[PDB]
Structure formats: C-alpha cells, structure tokens
Amino acid sequence: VGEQFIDLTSDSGGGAYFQPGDTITKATVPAEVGPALDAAEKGLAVLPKEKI
Amino acid sequence: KNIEIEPRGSETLKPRGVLPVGQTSAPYQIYDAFLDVTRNAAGWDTQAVRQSL
C-alpha cells in the first residue's frame, strides 16, 4: 500500500564512518510496478493459446 | 480468516467434543506462497533455463 522509507545497508558493518554533511553516491531503487505489469501482459500475450 | 466445517458421519458430536487433529487442517498462508515463489525464483539460472527451452 505504501509507506516508503530509506535503508542504510553496509555489508562490512565497521571501519570508517561518514561525517556530517557528506553524501552517499551509491544507491538502488526497487523495480516499479508498471514495467512489471507491462512485462507480464506481453509475456502472457505472446503465447499462442490455440497451440496450447 | 474463518473456519469451514464439513459434516460427516452419523454419530452425534456431544457438547465439549474435540475433533481429532487428523480431521483438521491449517491454511496455506499468502505470505507463505509469496515467500516460496520468491525464494525459488531467486536461485534460478535464467540464462540456462532460456537456453534449455
């Protein structure tokens, strides 16, 4: 339903730490629902049902 | 969630009667289904599958 947030994931979990005012340049974003819906529709549509 | 009862047999179930564990079932959760399908799909080698097909 929603409730977006941001998570900070560090595999090492130790060592040097960020200082105030710095920036994190590496990030990721989840796959959107719209492209997944389009891909599912196309993948199901290309199948020949009479052949099935 | 809700309980569904399917009556069977002729003997009357007395008050405070207990159905055996062998006559009752638990649901297959929707989150269980999502977990199973996602964990199974994570390990797929999609290139190998497409090449085999």
Partner: protein
C-alpha cells in the same frame, strides 16, 4: 514447491548438454530405426512361423 532452483538448474544444464547440436544425430537415429523396423515388420508372418 516444484520450482526449486536446484532441480530446475540441474535439469536445464543437463538438457543443454544432451540436446545441443544433436538434431542431426537424432534425425539419423529416427531414419535408420524407421527403415530397420519397417524391414523387420515386413517379415511379421515369417517371425510368427
């Protein structure tokens, strides 16, 4: 439960290994066995006797 990645990957790799470039081999198998079996079945009465 039938989509376990281990079995799917093993079957996929095995099919790739077995049936890659084997179309001509299987065609030869089918042609030769068709001819041999037709010749053998033309002697059905002889085999029965």
């Amino acid at each position: 439960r039938s989509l376990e990645p281990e079995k799917v990957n093993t079957i996929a790799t095995s099919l790739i290994t077995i049936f890659q470039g084997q179309g001509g081999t299987i065609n030869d198998i089918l042609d030769q066995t068709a001819q041999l079996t037709a010749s053998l079945a033309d002697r059905d009465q002889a085999i029965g006797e």
